[PDB]
């Protein structure tokens, strides 16, 4: 697994891979790791799939029920705190490693991380999964303040690709989603669309 | 009824307790007095037929070697607090390795009087109060003591008390025949003559029960022959 | 693990009209030292005193329980608590946690109801007994023999049976604690003494070896 | 009515829960506790009568700090109102513990009204006898004022007059401009109102309580300083005659 | 008899006098409402009585958004209407969570009435006084109107009215369906508004009425702000 | 294991209009005989029988509970029970104790009291019935039975040939297991009569 | 919660609430049920009288299983409870025995519920009596259940507003030799005997139970049947 | 042990094997796996063979209840949700791998469920011991928008490749087709292997087995 | 099993006040994952706290303490909490939770300034509690406490600047000889006025020894 999330001025960008594994055999090669929670809020699953799916469903239910009363679009901190509590009350039975991203009218695009412990931190960008260790150095040497949309898109694509070559538990298709005020836009990359780097030969 | 149990009247007084205290005056008469060297307790037995050997009629019991008690009113509801008294005394001797005073015993026993309610009240609890008047007695760290009880949790120390049906005549005739330096003999003689005065029968030598507690000896309940020497006068 | 070894020794002595409770004032854990000021002696009444050693977190929450129970007894019975009653209560308090017990060695000292001296020794499960001298703690093994010799006159021949005094016992415990510091590591950095007699309580503090 | 008024679980022939009218009849015997909201905050003007002057100045307080940003002014029984204050405090603490931001006001009103209305159906309880008002101010939203009756109704107002003088006092708030003037030049209007409405023969004396919230207190609900209460009282005493 | 009028039990004739009494609790508020269904649209109209100029107008409203594609309007004993609404909301969300797809109207009305029935059997409680009208759009039957009751009996309708002027309004609406015609958007609102204009003789104003619509092109509950109510009121002018 | 603490074996076969069920006879503790008249086959109504194998405690308990339920069944609604319902009842009874189960492996054999055609079933520790048309076995010496039956059982057989083949299989099988044997019993069910027989075996 | 019975014995030993619930049911909708040689038929009436009242919205002859159905004659809301409870008792039966539950057991289990509401705390009896049909073991069955918990195995019965006149008229127009069509005709005739107005293909609903299963009749076939 | 399911132009095809083994001894040679969930939904199930039967029966009962209450044909999303939740409630102590599939008002739908509560919505899936060879056949010879008589052959080949190559599966082959106006449930579709002919007999005489006792009971 | 942890914390008391220091790192095992988080808080105007160990339990305690203080600052009675009460509450919480075998992997350091008197506490996962003029958790107990002790044994009256500089020095040494540290540490103070926090700081460093 490998998930990445980036923040720009008026919105955010997400990125994920399309592989699932149960050992050395591939049970699926197209799975979708981008789960919407509201009209303008998303999530990114990692670790066990059952626990992630359950947690995300319950959070979606609670957030819809809480928004239908106040008569106001929700915030991202709310969903992040709900996730925090749900994953902290059961930290001895769960393995989730989740990320949250979205948009709201008070503050602009927002990103948060929630590892297995039950913490909650916001950051200019975030990454997670097993194949992230292999790119902790690439996002550091390339990030810069003042990035536009397309820049974040191609940045996420390149990082995902570089993580999907050396790791055996990740690969396949690259799914992307761009969030802003006007609306959402999804995208999928495969084959000759994915970047390529020449292999070294003596 | 249509008035509940945990209710107040337009005088500030509960109803069921005011009604149960109206029963004590339907019981037998009991007397208890204190001196500088011992406490005496006495009670009357109202037998009904030449049968029913009065040896079984027991109204003066032993809470412990240094503590006794006497009851009046409903003798049935009385044998529920005595076991609690013994239990507490032994639990204290077990935890602290010493003897329980009289005040502590009476307080623990009276804490259980106003626990009652038609609602949940922790089911297995009481639906009404006890109709009984209790008179304790014994020696402790500070000389001989004596107490009194009522069915409302309002105990009070005293030195010469008398309960039962005719509790007035045995008090108006007890205010003047007491002084702070009386002995045991004259104490018992006064108690017995006033009992004679208030008794309904001819005061046989077995129509009454008696007991004494002084520092040297422990709780000692008199026999039938000892109750003869004293009645000769 | 739910336990820790903090070190600490305790000593107590009785007499005809007084009692003495001495202890160290050091708190360690492992190969390092936490602090050099943490005494063990504790005053409960004007005529009784206690001493505790072992696991700190267990020796810090029992004192509060005893204080509360003393207040409640005083409120219910209308009198203070003697020494034997204190010991009989502590036995049950310890035996309550039998399958999840404390790890503290207690020693009580004070005056008997007559006016004499009394010391009671305990064990972490709740077995106590009255004695004339005891040295529960980390250095008990070093002190008990010397006390046996110099207060019971054992293995001695033609030796009188003179009684003990206050100054004598004070000097004796001081020299003992001075001696036991050069061979034990969990002992040193201070010394505290609490004397209880027919006119109340006195406290004294003494300097010792650092290491 | 024979026995249609003995329980909260009984509709009378015309359709009426009499036990709630009988409760609200209690607030018609208490002192007036008006409050308003102009542009940047809320302002309450509770009045506490003087009885057995042996008391201190500040007993029988009728202005609680329910939370860091909302304030309450009650009218009726004080015990039930204190209980409801505890209820609101617990609600606002749980909301923050679960979500992570200061509770708004609409939700607080609705929740507390549900709690109050839970008692208007069964026979094992007694309807409350207090009718209070909540006030708050925020930067995202603006000034918010509300009100609750013992039945469980929550409506948003610009001015309320809970108390025995429910009438003859609301009128005195109409002539005022309860949306334009700032939160500093209304204390005088509220004070002169509660002063001229008071009867001097049926009651011996009273004392005046106040509160404040808005941009001046940075959303925090705090008492009104005394240095301005002095001039407020002067204005009232000079305006009465 | 004896305790037949104080709790939910049977009289010698089989009636539940408590529910009959509760039916009259809808007429206390003094309000009314109507709701009609057309070819591809459902519409609701209600009154709005605000006597005090000191009261915030944008907080008093009997219309509520149970959930997207569904809408409601209530009548009588406002204190309990919000409770019924909260229950509806919770039921709808729990259904969408349990069964994966949205709950229709008939199901929701049936559930609410199932709940409102046990109050007519148990004695420790009393029945709520309120009438709930609901509107929605299903992809199989089209528009759908529904109405529960305080007794638990519901039924499907094409048009109806509730509140104080119920019978006098039905007697007038019955004269219009006798001539089946095409009602797309402009033929429902006019009829629903003339019903009130004729039963009350008011010559309504664009703030004395609240309107809620849902049509096929846009199956989302709306409120018809004054900008459109003015136009629709001058249309038939 | 714990199933092999006692030993046992049972088998069931079908015929033309008849059916057969057989079992061994022995009770011992892991190496030692105690008695030779142990019961493992029980009637569940006329023209229906059930056999059990494994821990004696559990076979006793299961039989007692099953009769407790079946009697009430037949009493409420007045009619004999059919085999499929019995199979489902037993499966539910076993699955109830999915955790802390009974160590047993039943085998059911009988007819249909409406159209007298055969029926046989073989459950397991928990369930997964195996409704077959040839035969079923249950016990510790199962391989021997599966190897002897397969060769035999021509598709159609009369009562005599059926008795013969099942007896020969069971005998030549239990003579290859040490914790099972010391006797054999056989039951044959037809439309209007039932036959019960014992055999001459090695008591060693 | 209240814990005490509201139904008690009078000096004459009669439980009164039951008589009152029965008087209630006797003022509801008329309904009829017939058992012929092939199977069973159930018919009712739509007491409502109005024009708008979308009719393809609610029914009174809803089913239970593929071969069982119900109809009521009292008050509505207390019928859906019993529907929902029987629809679960049958599933319990099937889950235990993997065989559809017959009728003579469903009626028992449903009366066991309609009874315990006569000596339980805080509640009152139901106000609805049911007529139920079924087909099991090559045999049709028809039953009635009353609010007291007593089930009657009947033959061509009628309950509702004029159950007496319906019974007197049906006692002389039924025999255990007819087919189903004669039963349809007699059911409609009995319903019309006590009608007030003009019959039509919308005021009534019908259900049939035969060798296949339960089935309600569409508003078209009842129209053809309406012609004689 | 060799489940498989596929989606085609106008419906869904589904197949499995017919063998069961208690250890390493063939206990049965004709066992049914394609279970009925609703008149338009069928669920094939591997696993512990009881945890998968009870679950299916329960879900079918609840779905029948929902259908009777609502008044229209059920869907697949509801069954998926029910199974997901009931399996997650047990932390994996219920081995109930399945390939649930069916058709509803919308297009066809194919899901795969695992004992923990994970699901997928693939167009073709397999399961059981022997799933790898079948998945290989699929990956090689699969196409989109296929017809009926092609998908049937595809599934049959995929099953046979898992029969002849795994020690835990081999017998007659089943099948099932689900369209908007058809529910072909073919059992058996084809028989690849059979028993060999006998070359002799054993002389099953009469009266060659000893006996010690006898009893007779006449009936009516 | 703690996943994201924090390293040592420092505290020393000068004349009329106290000072605390803590780095910024949520290390996951041997990885420097999060590098701009704060492990110091501010309970009220006269009390501040610091934690080591797991970071989630720290957040839980932070939330609970904040809500407690808020519930206190509502009534209005002239009373308030003092560092002693916070210390006792923490000790009792830790003990009660450990007695159920579900501890909080954290190590707490408390400062404060009451009326004329300072405070400096220590709390552990097991309920071990004591006070002192100086202390440190983790490796800070081997590389930092010795220096502080040696400095106090000759001058037990310290000024603000002296404490600040000594703290910086011990932090430098920790950064040198520790493997789970970082050059971004906050330094908080509490005077008679109130509590104050200094932003992200960095220490001076020398590596000339590498030329030998």
List chains adjacent to chain C, taking adjacency as at least 3 C-beta pairs closer than 8 Å.
B, I
The residues with which E213 forms a beta bridge, in sequence order, are: E43
Three-state SS at H34: strand
What is the span of the domain harbouring residue A147? Answer: 1-202
Residue of I2, I3, I24 to mutate for A, most A C-beta atoms under 10 A:
I3
For the domain that residue C179 is a member of, what is the CATH number? Answer: 3.60.20.10
Q: Closest to C57 (Cβ–Cβ): which among I126, I132, I142?
A: I126
Residue of A21, A25, A26, A27 to mutate for H, most H C-beta atoms under 10 A:
A27
Contact E65 A64 (CB under 8 A): no
Residue I9 DSSP code: E
Listed residue (G188, G227, G189) closest to G206, CA to CA: G188
Q: Which helix (H) or strand (E) holds B110?
A: helix B102-110
Listed residue (I24, I19, I21, I20) closest to I6, CA to CA: I24
- If you measure CA to CA, which chain A residue comes closest to I54? A117
Burial E21-52 (b: 16+ CB within 10 A, else e): bbbbbbbebebbbbbbbbebbbbbbbbeeeee
Chains B and C touch (3+ CB pairs under 8 A): yes
Residue H132 DSSP code: H
Is residue E75 a contact partner of residue E130, using CB atoms and an 8 Å limit?
A: yes
Q: Which residues 39-98 on chain H approach chain E with CB closer than 8 angstroms?
A: 66, 70, 72, 75, 77-78, 80-81
- Say if E140 is an interface residue toward chain G (CB within 8 Å): no
Rounded CA separation E11/E2 (Å):
9
Catalytic residues of H: 1
For the domain that residue A148 is a member of, what is the CATH number? Answer: 3.60.20.10
- If you measure CA to CA, which chain I residue comes closest to C59? I128
Q: How far is C81 from chain B (nearest CA, A)?
A: 9
Name all domains of chain F by residue range, CATH numbers in brackets.
1-204 (3.60.20.10)
Q: Closest to I127 (Cβ–Cβ): which among C32, C35, C57?
A: C57
Length of chain H (residues) = 220
- The owner of tokens 């603000």 is I160
- Say if B103 is an interface residue toward chain C (CB within 8 Å): yes
- Say if D202 is an interface residue toward chain A (CB within 8 Å): no
Give, in words, the CATH class of G1-228: alpha beta
* DSSP-assigned letters across all residues of chain A: --EEEEEETTEEEEEE---EESSSSEEESS---B---BTTEEEE--S-HHHHHHHHHHHHHHHHHHHHHHTS---HHHHHHHHHHHHHTTTTT----EEEEE--SSS--EEEEE-TT---EE-SEEEESGGGGGGTTHHHHH--SS--HHHHHHHHHHHHHHHHHH-SS--S-EEEEEE-SS-EEEEEE-GGGS---PPP--
First CA to last CA distance, chain A: 32
For the domain that residue I12 is a member of, what is the CATH number? Answer: 3.60.20.10
Length of chain F (residues) = 204
Sign of CA dihedral G65, G71, G76, G81: negative
Three-state SS at B176: coil
- Which chain H residues are within 8 Å of F167, Cβ to Cβ? 209
Q: How far is G127 from chain E (nearest CA, A)?
A: 8
List chains adjacent to chain I, taking adjacency as at least 3 C-beta pairs closer than 8 Å.
A, C, D
Annotated catalytic residue: which of A1, A2, A52, A60? A1
- Which chain E residues are within 8 Å of G58, Cβ to Cβ? 154-156
Q: For residue E187, give every residue at least 6 positions away whose Cβ sits within 8 Å of its Cβ, in sequence order, or none.
A: E38, E181
Rounded CA separation F152/B221 (Å):
97
Beta-carbon pairs below 8 A across chains C and I = 36
- Say if E103 is an interface residue toward chain H (CB within 8 Å): no
What is the span of the domain harbouring residue I103? Answer: 1-212
* DSSP-assigned letters across all residues of C50-100: EEEEE-HHHHHHHHHHHHHHHHHHHHHHSS---HHHHHHHHHHHHHHSSSS
Chains G and C touch (3+ CB pairs under 8 A): no
Q: Closest to G23 (Cβ–Cβ): which among E13, E123, E177?
A: E13
- If you measure CA to CA, which chain H residue comes closest to F147? H25
Q: How far is I121 from chain D (nearest CA, A)?
A: 28
* DSSP-assigned letters across all residues of H78-126: HHHHHHHHHHHTTTT-S---B--EEE-SSSEEE-EE-TTS-EE--SEEE
Rounded CA separation I98/I92 (Å):
10
- Say if B229 is an interface residue toward chain C (CB within 8 Å): no
Contact I56 A118 (CB under 8 A): yes
Rounded CA separation I56/I4 (Å):
8
Q: Closest to E55 (Cβ–Cβ): which among D3, D124, D155?
A: D155
Residue of I66, I73, I76 to mutate for D, most D C-beta atoms under 10 A:
I76
Counted domains in chain D: 1
Q: Which helix (H) or strand (E) holds F114?
A: none
Our measurement of the distance from residue B84's CA atom to the centroid of its chain's CA atoms, rounded to an integer in Å, reads: 15
- If you measure CA to CA, which chain E residue comes closest to G19? E12
In chain F, where do the E strands start and end? 9-14, 19-24, 27-28, 33-35, 41-43, 48-51, 107-111, 118-122, 135-139, 184-189, 193-198
For the domain that residue B21 is a member of, what is the CATH number? Answer: 3.60.20.10
H91-95: long-range contacts, CB 8 A cutoff, minimum separation 24: H91/A93, H91/H116, H92/H116, H94/H51, H94/H55, H95/H47, H95/H48, H95/H51, H95/H52
Counted domains in chain B: 1
Cis amide leading into H188 (omega within 30) = yes
Rounded CA separation B141/B138 (Å):
10
Method: cryo-EM
The residues with which I197 forms a beta bridge, in sequence order, are: I188
Is residue H79 a contact partner of residue H63, using CB atoms and an 8 Å limit?
A: yes
What number of other Cβ atoms are within 10 A of residue F106's Cβ? 28
Contact H77 E107 (CB under 8 A): no
- Say if E99 is an interface residue toward chain H (CB within 8 Å): yes
Query: Phi and psi (nearest 5°) for E92?
Result: -60, -45
What number of other Cβ atoms are within 10 A of residue C179's Cβ? 13
Q: Closest to H77 (Cβ–Cβ): which among E101, E107, E140?
A: E101
Residue C153 zone, left/alpha/beta (φ > 0; ψ -120 to 50; rest): left
List chains adjacent to chain H, taking adjacency as at least 3 C-beta pairs closer than 8 Å.
A, E, F, G
Rounded CA separation H71/H74 (Å):
9
Q: Which helix (H) or strand (E) holds E45?
A: strand E41-47
- Say if F202 is an interface residue toward chain H (CB within 8 Å): no
Is residue E32 a contact partner of residue E62, using CB atoms and an 8 Å limit?
A: no
What is the span of the domain harbouring residue C89? Answer: 1-211
Three-state SS at D9: coil
Is residue C113 a contact partner of residue C198, using CB atoms and an 8 Å limit?
A: no
Rounded CA separation F94/F73 (Å):
18
Q: Closest to I67 (Cβ–Cβ): which among D64, D65, D93?
A: D93
Domain H1-220 homologous superfamily, CATH: Aminohydrolase, N-terminal nucleophile (Ntn) domain (3.60.20.10)
- If you measure CA to CA, which chain E residue comes closest to D178? E54
Is residue E27 a contact partner of residue E131, using CB atoms and an 8 Å limit?
A: no
- The owner of tokens 């409704």 is F131
Rounded CA separation F138/F142 (Å):
6
Listed residue (F46, F8, F2) closest to F170, CA to CA: F8
Length of chain D (residues) = 241
Structure token pair of residue F108: 């059911």
- Say if I95 is an interface residue toward chain C (CB within 8 Å): yes
- The owner of tokens 């195995």 is G153
- Which chain H residues are within 8 Å of F164, Cβ to Cβ? 204-206, 208-209
What number of other Cβ atoms are within 10 A of residue A147's Cβ? 18
Listed residue (H101, H201, H94) closest to H151, CA to CA: H101
Length of chain B (residues) = 233
Chains B and A touch (3+ CB pairs under 8 A): no
- Which chain D residues are within 8 Å of A69, Cβ to Cβ? 107, 110
* DSSP-assigned letters across all residues of C87-121: HHHHHHHHHHSSSS---EEEEEEEE-TTS-EEEEE
Q: How far is A123 from chain I (nearest CA, A)?
A: 9
- Say if F114 is an interface residue toward chain G (CB within 8 Å): no
Counted domains in chain A: 1
Rounded CA separation C19/C111 (Å):
7
* DSSP-assigned letters across all residues of A102-133: E--SSS--EEEEE-TT---EE-SEEEESGGGG
- The owner of tokens 């529920």 is B80
Name all domains of chain E by residue range, CATH numbers in brackets.
1-237 (3.60.20.10)
Contact A53 H118 (CB under 8 A): yes
Exposure of E33 in the CB half-sphere (CA atoms within 13 A): 28
Counted domains in chain C: 1
Beta-carbon pairs below 8 A across chains F and G = 16
- If you measure CA to CA, which chain A residue comes closest to D101? A78
- Which chain E residues are within 8 Å of D9, Cβ to Cβ? 7, 123-126
Distances (CA, A) of C105 to C54, C59, C187, F200: 6, 9, 16, 77
């Amino acid at each position: 697994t490998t998930i990445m999330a980036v923040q720009f001025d008026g919105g955010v960008v997400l990125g994920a891979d399309s592989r699932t594994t149960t050992g050395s055999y591939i049970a699926n090669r197209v799975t979708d790791k981008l789960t919407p929670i509201h009209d303008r809020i998303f999530c990114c699953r990692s670790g066990s799939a059952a626990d992630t799916q359950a947690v995300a469903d319950a959070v979606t239910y609670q957030l819809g029920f809480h928004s239908i009363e106040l008569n106001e679009p929700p915030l991202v901190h709310t969903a992040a705190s709900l996730f925090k509590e749900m994953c902290y009350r059961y930290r001895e039975d769960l393995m989730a490693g989740i990320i949250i991203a979205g948009w709201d009218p008070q503050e602009g695009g927002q990103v948060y991380s929630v590892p297995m412990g039950g913490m909650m931190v916001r950051q200019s960008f975030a990454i997670g999964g097993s194949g992230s260790s292999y790119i902790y150095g690439y996002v550091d040497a390339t990030y810069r303040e003042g990035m536009t949309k397309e820049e974040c898109l191609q940045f996420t694509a390149n990082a995902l690709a570089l993580a999907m070559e050396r790791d055996g538990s990740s690969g396949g298709v690259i799914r992307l989603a761009a969030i802003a005020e006007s609306g959402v836009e999804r995208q999928v990359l495969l084959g000759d669309q994915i970047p390529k780097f020449a292999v070294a030969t003596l | 009824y249509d008035r509940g149990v945990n209710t107040f009247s337009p005088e500030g007084r509960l109803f069921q307790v005011e009604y149960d205290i109206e029963a004590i005056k339907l019981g037998s008469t009991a007397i208890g007095i204190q001196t500088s060297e011992g406490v005496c307790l006495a009670v009357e037995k109202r037998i009904t037929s030449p049968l029913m050997e009065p040896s079984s009629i027991e109204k003066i019991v032993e809470i412990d070697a240094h503590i006794g008690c006497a009851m009046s009113g409903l003798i049935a509801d009385a044998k529920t607090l005595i076991d609690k008294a013994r239990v507490e005394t032994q639990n204290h001797w077990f935890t602290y390795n010493e003897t329980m005073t009289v005040e502590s015993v009476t307080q623990a026993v009276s804490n259980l009087a106003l626990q009652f309610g038609e609602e949940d009240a922790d089911p297995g609890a009481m639906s009404r109060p006890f109709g009984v008047a209790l008179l304790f007695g014994g020696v402790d760290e500070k000389g001989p003591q004596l107490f009194h009880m009522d069915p409302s949790g309002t105990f009070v120390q005293c030195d010469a008390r008398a309960i039962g049906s005719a509790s007035e005549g045995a008090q108006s005739s007890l205010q003047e025949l007491y002084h702070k330096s009386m002995t045991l003999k004259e104490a018992i003689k006064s108690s017995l003559i006033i009992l004679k005065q208030v008794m309904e029968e001819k005061l046989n030598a077995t129509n009454i029960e008696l007991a004494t507690v002084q520092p040297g000896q422990n709780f000692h309940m008199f026999t039938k022959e000892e109750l003869e020497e004293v009645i000769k006068d | 693990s739910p336990y820790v070894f903090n070190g600490g020794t305790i000593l107590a002595i009785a007499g005809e009209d007084f009692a003495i409770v001495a202890s160290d004032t050091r708190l360690s854990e492992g190969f390092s030292i936490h602090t050099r000021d943490s005494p063990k002696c504790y005053k409960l009444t004007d005529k009784t005193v206690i001493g505790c050693s072992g696991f700190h977190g267990d020796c810090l929450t029992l004192t509060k329980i005893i204080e509360a129970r003393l207040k409640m007894y005083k409120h219910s019975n209308n009198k203070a608590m003697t020494t034997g009653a204190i010991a009989a209560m502590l036995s049950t308090i310890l035996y309550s946690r039998r399958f999840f017990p404390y790890y503290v060695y207690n020693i009580i000292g004070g005056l008997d109801e007559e006016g004499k001296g009394a010391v009671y020794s305990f064990d972490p499960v709740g077995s106590y007994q009255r004695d004339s001298f005891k040295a529960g703690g980390s250095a008990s093994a070093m002190l008990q023999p010397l006390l046996d010799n110099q207060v019971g006159f054992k293995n001695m021949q033609n030796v009188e049976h003179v009684p003990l005094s206050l100054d004598r016992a004070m000097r004796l415990v001081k020299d003992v604690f001075i001696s036991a510091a050069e061979r034990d590591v969990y002992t040193g950095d201070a010394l505290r003494i609490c004397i209880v007699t027919k006119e109340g309580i006195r406290e004294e503090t003494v300097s010792l070896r650092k290491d | 009515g024979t026995g249609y008024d003995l329980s909260a679980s009984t509709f009378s022939p015309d359709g009426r829960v009499f036990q709630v009218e009988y409760a609200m009849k209690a607030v018609e015997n208490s002192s007036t506790a008006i409050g308003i909201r102009c542009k940047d905050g809320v302002v309450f003007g509770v009045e506490k009568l003087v009885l057995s002057k042996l008391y201190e100045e500040g007993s029988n307080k009728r202005l609680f700090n329910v939370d860091r940003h909302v304030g309450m002014a009650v009218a009726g029984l004080l015990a039930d109102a204190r209980s409801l204050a505890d209820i609101a405090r617990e609600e606002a603490s749980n909301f923050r513990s679960n979500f992570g931001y200061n509770i708004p006001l609409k939700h607080l009103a609705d929740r507390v009204a549900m709690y109050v209305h839970a008692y208007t159906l069964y026979s094992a309880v007694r309807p409350f006898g207090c009718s209070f008002m909540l006030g708050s101010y925020s930067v995202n939203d603006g000034a918010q004022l509300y009100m609750i009756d013992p039945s469980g109704v929550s409506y948003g107002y610009w001015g309320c007059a809970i108390g025995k003088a429910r009438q003859a006092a609301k009128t005195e708030i109409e002539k005022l401009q309860m949306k334009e003037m700032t939160c500093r030049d209304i204390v005088k209007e509220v004070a002169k109102i509660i002063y001229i409405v008071h009867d001097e023969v049926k009651d011996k004396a009273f004392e005046l309580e106040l509160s404040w919230v808005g941009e001046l207190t940075n959303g925090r609900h705090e008492i009104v300083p005394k240095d301005i209460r002095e001039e407020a009282e002067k204005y009232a005493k000079e305006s009465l005659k | 008899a004896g305790f037949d009028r104080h709790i939910t039990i049977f009289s010698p004739e089989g009636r539940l006098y408590q529910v009959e009494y509760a039916f009259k609790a809808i007429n206390q508020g003094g309000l009314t409402s109507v709701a009609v269904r057309g070819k591809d649209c459902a519409v609701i109209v209600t009154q709005k009585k605000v006597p005090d100029k000191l009261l915030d107008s944008s907080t008093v409203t009997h219309l509520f958004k149970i959930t997207e594609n569904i809408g409601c309007v209530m009548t009588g004993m406002t204190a309990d209407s919000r409770s019924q609404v909260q229950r509806a909301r919770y039921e709808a969300a729990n259904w969408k969570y349990k069964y994966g797809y949205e709950i229709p109207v008939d199901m929701l009305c049936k559930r609410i009435a199932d709940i409102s029935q046990v109050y007519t059997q148990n004695a420790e409680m009393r029945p709520l006084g309120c009438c709930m009208i609901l509107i929605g759009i299903d992809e199989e039957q089209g528009p759908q109107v529904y109405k529960c009751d305080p007794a638990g009996y519901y039924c499907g309708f094409k048009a109806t009215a509730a509140g104080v002027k119920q019978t006098e309004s039905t007697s007038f609406l019955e004269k219009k369906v006798k001539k089946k015609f095409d009602w797309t958007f402009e033929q429902t609102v006019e009829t629903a508004i003339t019903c009130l204009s004729t039963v009350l003789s008011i010559d309504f104003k664009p703030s004395e009425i609240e309107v809620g619509v849902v049509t096929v092109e846009n199956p989302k509950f709306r409120i018809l702000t004054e900008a459109e109510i003015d136009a629709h009121l001058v249309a038939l002018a | 294991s714990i199933m092999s603490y006692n030993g046992g074996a049972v088998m069931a076969m079908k015929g033309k209009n008849c059916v057969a069920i057989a079992a061994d006879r022995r009770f011992g503790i892991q190496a030692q005989l105690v008695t030779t008249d142990f019961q493992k086959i029980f009637p569940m109504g006329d023209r229906l029988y059930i056999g059990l194998a494994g821990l004696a405690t559990d076979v006793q308990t299961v039989a007692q509970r099953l009769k407790f339920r079946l009697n009430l069944y037949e009493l409420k609604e007045g009619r004999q029970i059919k085999p499929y319902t019995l199979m489902s009842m037993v499966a539910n009874l076993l699955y109830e104790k999915r955790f802390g189960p009974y160590y047993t492996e039943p085998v059911i054999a009988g007819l249909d009291p409406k159209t007298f055609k055969p029926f046989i079933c073989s459950l397991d520790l928990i369930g997964c019935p195996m409704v077959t048309d040839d035969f079923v076995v249950s016990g510790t010496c199962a391989e021997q039975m599966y190897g002897m039956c397969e060769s035999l059982w021509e598709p159609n057989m009369d009562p005599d040939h059926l008795f013969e083949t099942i007896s020969q299989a069971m005998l030549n099988a239990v003579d290859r297991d040490a914790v099972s044997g010391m006797g054999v019993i056989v039951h044959i069910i037809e439309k209007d009569k039932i036959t019960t027989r014992t055999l001459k075996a090695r008591m060693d | 919660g209240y814990s005490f019975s509201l139904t008690t014995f009078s000096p004459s030993g009669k439980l009164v609430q039951i008589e009152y619930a029965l008087a209630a049911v006797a003022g509801g909708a008329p309904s009829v049920g017939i058992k012929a040689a092939n199977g069973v038929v159930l018919a009712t009436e739509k007491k409502q009288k109005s024009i708008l009242y979308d009719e393809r919205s609610v029914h009174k002859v809803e089913p239970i299983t593929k071969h069982i159905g119900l109809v009521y004659s009292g008050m509505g809301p207390d019928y859906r409870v019993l529907v929902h409870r029987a629809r679960k008792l049958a599933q319990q039966y099937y889950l235990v025995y993997q065989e559809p539950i017959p009728t003579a057991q469903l009626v028992q289990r449903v009366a066991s519920v309609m009874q315990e509401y006569t000596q339980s705390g805080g509640v009152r009896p139901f106000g609805v009596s049911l007529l139920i049909c079924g087909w099991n073991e090559g045999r049709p069955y028809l039953f009635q259940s009353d609010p007291s918990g007593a089930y009657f195995a009947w033959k061509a019965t009628a309950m509702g507003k004029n159950y007496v006149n319906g019974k007197t008229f049906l006692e002389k127009r039924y025999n255990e030799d007819l087919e189903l069509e004669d039963a349809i005709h007699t059911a409609i005739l009995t319903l019309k005997e006590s009608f007030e107005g003009q019959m039509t293909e919308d005021n009534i609903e019908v259900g049939i139970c035969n060798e296949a299963g339960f089935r309600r009749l569409t508003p078209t076939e009842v129209k053809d049947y309406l012609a004689a | 042990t060799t489940i498989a399911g596929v989606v085609y132009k106008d419906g869904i095809v589904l197949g499995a094997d017919t063998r069961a083994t208690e250890g390493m001894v063939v206990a049965d040679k004709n066992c049914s796996k394609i279970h009925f969930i609703s008149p338009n939904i069928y669920c094939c199930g591997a696993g512990t063979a009881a945890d998968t039967d009870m679950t299916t029966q329960l879900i079918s009962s609840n779905l029948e209840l929902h259908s009777l209450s609502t008044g229209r044909l059920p869907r697949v999303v509801t069954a998926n949700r029910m199974l997901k939740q009931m399996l997650f409630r047990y932390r994996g102590y219920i081995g109930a791998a399945l390939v649930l599939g069916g058709v509803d008002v919308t297009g066809p739908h194919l899901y795969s469920i695992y004992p923990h509560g994970s699901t997928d919505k693939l167009p073709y899936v397999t399961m059981g011991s022997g799933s790898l060879a079948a998945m290989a056949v699929f990956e090689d010879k699969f196409r989109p928008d296929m017809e009926e008589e092609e998908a049937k052959n595809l599934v049959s080949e995929a099953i046979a490749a898992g029969i002849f190559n795994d020690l835990g599966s081999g017998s007659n082959i089943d099948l099932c087709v689900i369209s908007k106006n058809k529910l072909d449930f073919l059992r058996p579709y084809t028989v690849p292997n059979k028993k060999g002919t006998r070359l002799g007999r054993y002389r099953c005489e009469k009266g060659t087995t000893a006996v010690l006792t006898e009893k007779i009971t006449p009936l009516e | 099993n703690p996943m994201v942890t924090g390293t040592s914390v420092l505290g020393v008391k000068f004349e009329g006040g106290v000072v605390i220091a803590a780095d910024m790192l949520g290390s996951y095992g041997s990885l420097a994952r999060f590098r701009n988080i704060s492990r110091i808080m501010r309970v009220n105007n006269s009390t501040m706290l610091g934690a080591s160990g797991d970071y989630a339990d720290f957040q839980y305690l932070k939330q609970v303490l904040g809500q407690m203080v808020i519930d206190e600052e509502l009534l209005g009675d002239g009373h308030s909490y003092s560092p002693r009460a916070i210390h006792s509450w923490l000790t009792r919480a830790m003990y009660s939770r450990r007695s159920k075998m579900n501890p909080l992997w954290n190590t707490m350091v408390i400062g404060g300034y009451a009326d004329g008197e300072s405070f400096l506490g220590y709390v552990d996962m097991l309920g071990v509690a004591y006070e002192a003029p100086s202390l440190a958790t983790g490796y800070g107990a081997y590389l930092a406490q010795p220096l502080l002790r040696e400095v106090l044994e000759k001058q037990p009256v310290l000024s603000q600047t002296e404490a600040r500089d000594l703290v910086e020095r011990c932090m430098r040494v920790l950064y040198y000889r520790d493997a789970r540290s970082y050059n971004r540490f906050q330094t908080a103070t509490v005077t008679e006025k109130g509590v104050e926090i200094e932003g992200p700081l960095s220490t001076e460093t020398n590596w000339d020894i590498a030329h030998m």
